[PDB]
Design a protein around this ligand. Sequence first.
Ligand code: NGE
Ligand code: NGE
Lengths: 495, 497
Amino acid sequence: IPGISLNEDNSHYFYTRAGRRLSAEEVDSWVDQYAGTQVKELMLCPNCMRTSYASQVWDPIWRGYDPAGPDDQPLLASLPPEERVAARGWIHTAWQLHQDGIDIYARWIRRCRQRGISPWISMRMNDVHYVNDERCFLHSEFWRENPQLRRVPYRFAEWTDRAFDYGRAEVREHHLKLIRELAARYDFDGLELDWMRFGFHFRPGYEAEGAEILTAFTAEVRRLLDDWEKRRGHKIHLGARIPSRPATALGLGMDAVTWARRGLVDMLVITPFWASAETDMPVEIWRQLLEGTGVTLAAGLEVLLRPYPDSPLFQTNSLETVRGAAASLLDRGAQRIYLFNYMDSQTAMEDLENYPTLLREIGSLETLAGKPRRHVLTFADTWAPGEPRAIPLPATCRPGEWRAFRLHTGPKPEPGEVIAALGIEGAIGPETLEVRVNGELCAFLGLVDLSKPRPDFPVYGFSVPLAAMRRGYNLIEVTARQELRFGWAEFLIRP
Amino acid sequence: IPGISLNEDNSHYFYTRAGRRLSAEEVDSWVDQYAGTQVKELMLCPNCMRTSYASQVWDPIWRGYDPAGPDDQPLLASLPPEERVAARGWIHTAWQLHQDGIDIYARWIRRCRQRGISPWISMRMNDVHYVNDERCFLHSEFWRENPQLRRVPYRFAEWTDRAFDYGRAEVREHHLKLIRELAARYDFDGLELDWMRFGFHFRPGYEAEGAEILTAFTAEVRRLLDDWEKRRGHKIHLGARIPSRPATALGLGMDAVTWARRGLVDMLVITPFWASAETDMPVEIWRQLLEGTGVTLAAGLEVLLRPYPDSPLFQTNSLETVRGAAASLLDRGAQRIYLFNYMDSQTAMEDLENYPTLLREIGSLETLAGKPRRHVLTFADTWAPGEPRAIPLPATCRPGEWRAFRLHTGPKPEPGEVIAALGIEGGVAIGPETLEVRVNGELCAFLGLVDLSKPRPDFPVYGFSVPLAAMRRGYNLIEVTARQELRFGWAEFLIRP
Ligand SMILES: O=C(CO)N[C@H]1[C@H]([C@H](O)[C@H](O)CO)O[C@](O)(C(=O)O)C[C@@H]1O
Ligand SMILES: O=C(CO)N[C@H]1[C@H]([C@H](O)[C@H](O)CO)O[C@](O)(C(=O)O)C[C@@H]1O
């Protein structure tokens, strides 16, 4: 079966377990929820601009920390009073584990290997959370002291504006120092260069030179791990997270076809940044690009599910919507489903009771088969600077005009019900819309009470004749008698 | 050098030479203007829904024609009186040629090799001109009698709604009858399948089964040409015209990577349909996709240059703007520049005096190098039904907001002037500090209003002096912020040593 790669971020475990002395036994139990599922690999993130373990070459999260002191101390001063409580949870929990001689990543790796999971280290290569606050606890003293090493000096409109420029040798050396320590300190099966935090690593306009620079950096990483294979006596993998379309990937200085062909990486994770999980990604094109290279292609899901970038909705995926994306992507040739931000609490799916069910279904077409699923239209949140953007929603239809929406619904539906659903933003009757799926007339059903995630405007349901649906993309065509704007579209498949 | 491939359409010669009695010598003389140029292959197109030659298996353009009759005769009755004169120039020149025992395509093929040019035939697979007019002279009787074989029966909002559905067996057989006759009648160096007239071949939603079907159809074509290889005593090439981006090509049922890997085709032309040349096409991606297949990748240019699909401007490329596109696409790895609608008259660049210079320059970075060129921002006119569209212009900038435009300018600039030029739509006057323009992060000095040569917008264009050493090989980034709300309708890089 393809199976699941699940990412545990750098902060979550420390935020959620704060205020309790953690025993080695408890730390170990975290790995156990993942045993005997479709999870093949845990990607354990130990860093932002700072480490959550006791690094000797970077700043740990607790550098500057007074354990005994009040919340209002120099490290937390720049935060509002209530946000210091959460930040100090992370800082104090990670500190107290060090004090107790517990290395969390050393214990998780060891427990993974007992429970038949492959343990990975995922490194955040260029995290910029809260760089609007130059005094923030989670920035490195290296970032604070070296404003000249940033990507964009002439403006500050986005956090990525203040990310590090890997065009600079001092910047590449800074990140290679952590990878050198991480190789030494931890015997992991694989290192995953998480380029997708936050995906922007070069001066605007120098991305072509950047592609050469990143390919050369990757080669140095692979050479280092080749040396640790001998010391460690087992193969060590190298993977990377990159954008969802191949033109955007190259446009952000990530030429992965070259990394693959030169044998530098053996896994690639195509993924959005954050704003929504892309239900539509061109997997088939990447498979053709990567033919013969021995690289596993993983399709990355994010937790949010949102219809367009300006939407005020911030709801997460549900078991049904993840079943929809999983079936789609596996059908298109994904060799792994990768879950970022699907954790056991706080940053997680809102229907959390379904978590164990999810970890045992979405890694295979046979386990998803004949279970209800939802294929929601969304959008690509990440484009190279000045690259034309393609955003389906929202969509206006004037009187007598036609609008089409293609949605990837993966395997041909089993015997059962198929609904096409359309949310209208801003007053329709049953004859205002004519809806066809693959040419075929769909019967009006009336208003549909959607489970979360759902818009906050009316959703109208159309009955699709079962035999209309095909394998892969499905085409919703509509014409309106009155001017309307669409803000949501999905297929629901219910055997 | 990569060189040029140049497409002569099915109608143009007959339109422009109408009302002269043509001799064999004159007919031969057409090829001669392409001799001693960077043109390597003439793509000769003999068909729409009707052939311009005397077919035995399809309708010639003159089926139903009364040579002696008046303009107002059955074949032309459906047309406005003025439009009848031009239509009949096409029908009567193609008819008279046949009456005088001249097969125009036989003669062009022969002359081509006398002149060192490789001659190709280029078939239009699904032309739909004027299908709003059910009684139009240039439709096949097969098309008129078989409305059930069209793509879309539930509406007529575009010509492509009445295109044929290649998902049907009877449609494939109809187009395979023409290929079988073309391979028998003409000794060509290769056949091009022109899928991009007009690009839409399948019922909306069935493009996945369409891909499997067109791959098998391409496999039958290749197998048939393998047979003719032994009869003709030399190699016959098979090529196709496909969309500009791999996701759209597959979405319209064209899996060219499979055609290339299975050895079905040895040339692919990536191209827009019509509405504008694309100056930005992902050549480098296609090159990675086709690696190890020996397929010749050609970048197709169209004659129109327009900034956005809803623009009312209909101006053609200039020598400078083709220099621009050509340099960009070669720099990116195009193994040929392919010209569509760049004829010798009527359907032609507006600066026609510069056509001989064009056919001697755009074929190599060496012959383009140091020469004035323009790199204009446009748009891709063709997307798969319901595929989201990425259109850069027009672009609104609110006060203190930033907008970026990435323009592919191919080779680094030689010692000279580089200008970023930006057209502002609407009735709003800017000051010289209204805009802040950066290229690859570097400030560009306001130059004032630019008087662009055609093609150009009908709204003010402002020029910014780019520091030379800012510019890089490949994509170059324009970043703009405005102190007042503005809409951009035009962007370019002008590079003049
Ligand atoms: O906000 C929290 C928990 O309070 N953690 C966030 C977490 C957090 O801000 C970082 O781990 C800080 O280094 O960041 C992410 O992992 C992310 O980058 O997508 C999402 C997660 O919700
Ligand atoms: O309209 C005319 C004749 O004046 N020729 C047009 C020509 C013409 O309509 C067709 O050859 C008729 O089948 O079509 C094209 O080649 C085209 O498809 O882009 C354009 C060309 O300008």
